[PDB]
Amino acid sequence: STGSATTTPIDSLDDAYITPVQIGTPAQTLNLDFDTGSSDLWVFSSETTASEVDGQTIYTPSKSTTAKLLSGATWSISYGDGSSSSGDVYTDTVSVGGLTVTGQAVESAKKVSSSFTEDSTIDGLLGLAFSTLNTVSPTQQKTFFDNAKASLDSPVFTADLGYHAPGTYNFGFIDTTAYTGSITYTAVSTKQGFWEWTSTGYAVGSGTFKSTSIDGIADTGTTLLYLPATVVSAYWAQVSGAKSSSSVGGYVFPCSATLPSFTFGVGSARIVIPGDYIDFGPISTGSSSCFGGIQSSAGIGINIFGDVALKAAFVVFNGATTPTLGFASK
């Protein structure tokens, strides 16, 4: 089997991407944030505290003839931005882009934190990291991908995120028309439950490439590119007036600037992020200070190749017995 679904930016800055997902019978379609940095599929629901729902589409398990309470199971998750959610669990039929999994754990939110409530466009998350991070207790549950894997033509999914445009998540096949050149594959460590890999270095603009190992994670659920302070300082040093602002919470730059590109290494290959991808707009409405899309990972504890980096590539998440990651230009 295979699946193919379009993913669409939620706003003009590509802060996140939503992908429609069919849950239950008859189908209830919710727009989920596909997240290769976590492993829970959770949704706003009829059980979510009413004051914590503001415009989201909800899953109502009582209206699904295939929903079943997973007795005794609860879940609770906290994300890197300090956001959180928790609730109970149903099993139900879940389909993405024509690919159907029966008996998928659908984690129904009873509570969500304010940042979730405030984002009316995101109806929940669909985790695509390794199932070892799944938070369901007392019986850990499998991700949609892990459940689908055996049925897929090939045990892979791909992320093809657009810049200010829709893109695609494919399951079970590699669309050879979706990228240019060849895909370069690189080793993955699953020891922390993430799609963790080692970049071979970087360049800033037209500068020379610096060969240096940068361990990090391929994370579709993180907006920005978080890298060591040395790397990030070398980038922003090439932008007149750029500075790190503790009050704003990162590097900012004059909105009048034209940003340089940033290149990262994948083996002997190179992925170029155009400068425009690194512009996240005014820090507040009408401001002439703009927020940078490359930020320091110091204090996070891990480097994160988030959407800013991933949307510059066609990315293969290869879930074979020994997982690997593939990157191509596009």
Ligand X SMILES: N=C(N)NOCC[C@H](N)C(=O)O
Which residues of the chain form contacts with ligand X (CB under 6 A)? 35, 37-38, 79-81, 83, 115, 219, 221-222
3-state secondary structure of 232: helix
Closest by CA position to 121, among listed 217, 13, 36, 49: 13
Q: Which is nearer to ligand X, 80 or 193 (CB)?
A: 80
Cis peptide before 26 (omega within 30 of 0): yes
Q: Which is nearer to ligand X, 80 or 207 (CB)?
A: 80
What is the identity of the amino acid at 71? S
Specify the residue, 38 or 95, whose C-beta has the smaller distance to ligand X: 38
Residue number, 52 or 219, with CB nearest to ligand X: 219
> Residue for token digits 């300082």?
233
Taking a C-beta distance cutoff of 8 angstroms, is the pair 162, 114 a contact?
no
Q: Catalogue the active-site residues.
A: 35, 199
Nearer to ligand X, 159 or 269 (CB): 159
Q: CA-CA distance, 226 to 304, in Å (whole number)?
A: 5
Least distance CB 80 / ligand X (angstroms): 5
Cα distances (Å, whole numbers) of residue 271 to 103, 199, 233, 263, 305: 38, 10, 20, 6, 12
Q: After which residues does the chain show a gap where C to N exceeds 2.5 Å?
A: none
How far CA 89 is from CA of 74, 79, 109, 115, in Å, comes to 6, 19, 9, 22
Cβ partners under 8 Å of residue 6, min gap 6: 19, 20, 97, 166, 167, 168
Q: Nearest distance from residue 312's CB to ligand X, in Å?
A: 18
Q: Which is it for strands 225-227 and 294-296: parallel, antiparallel or unpaired?
A: parallel
Q: Half-sphere exposure of 289 toward its Cβ, with a 13 Å CA cutoff? A: 13
Minimum separation from the CB atom of position 220 to ligand X (A): 7
Measured from the CB of residue 301, what is the shortest distance to ligand X in angstroms? 13
52: left (phi over 0), alpha (psi -120 to 50) or beta: alpha
Residue 202 carries which side chain, given as an amino acid letter?
Y
Quick check: 288 and 254 in contact, CB under 8 A? yes
Closer to ligand X by CB, 134 or 200: give it.
134
- Taking the complex as a whole, the smallest distance from the CB of residue 83 to ligand X amounts, in Å, to 4
Whose Cβ is closer to ligand X: residue 23's or residue 112's? 112
